[PDB]
C-alpha cells in the first residue's frame, strides 16, 4: 500500500512515513455486543416471524433460494438485504425441526 513516489500510476502519491493511528471507537458501531445478541435472540424467541419471513421460509423450502432471494429483494430495500435475510431465514430453517 506504499506510494510509488510519482504522480501517476497505481499507487501514485508522495512517499510518507506512516503511523497507523490508534483505532477509533467508531468503526465499531455495529459490533458484536453479547448483550444485544442475547436480547435479539430472546426477542426472536418470544415474537415469531413476520408474514413475509414465513413466506420467505416457505419459498426456500418449496421454490429454492433464488426465488426466495428475488421475493426478499422485492420485500426489502436492496439485494444485499435480501441476501442477508435469506441467509438468516435458512439459518432459522436449519435450527428448526431439521436440526
Amino acid at each position: 500500500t506504499v506510494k510509488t513516489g510519482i504522480a501517476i500510476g497505481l499507487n501514485k502519491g508522495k512517499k510518507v512515513t506512516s503511523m497507523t493511528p490508534a483505532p477509533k471507537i467508531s468503526y465499531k458501531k455495529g459490533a458484536a455486543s453479547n448483550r444485544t445478541k442475547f436480547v435479539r435472540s430472546l426477542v426472536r424467541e418470544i415474537a415469531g416471524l413476520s408474514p413475509y419471513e414465513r413466506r420467505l421460509i416457505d419459498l426456500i423450502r418449496n421454490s429454492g433460494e433464488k426465488r426466495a432471494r428475488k421475493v426478499a429483494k422485492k420485500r426489502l430495500g436492496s439485494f444485499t438485504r435480501a441476501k442477508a435475510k435469506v441467509e438468516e431465514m435458512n439459518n432459522i430453517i436449519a435450527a428448526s425441526r431439521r436440526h
Binding site: 436480547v39 435479539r40 426477542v43 418470544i46 415474537a47 415469531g48 416471524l49 413476520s50 408474514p51 413475509y52
Partner: peptide, 12 residues
Amino acid sequence: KYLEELQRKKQS
C-alpha cells in the same frame, strides 16, 4: 432494550 428490540417486530 427489550422494549426497543420488540418494538421493531411490528408484524409479529
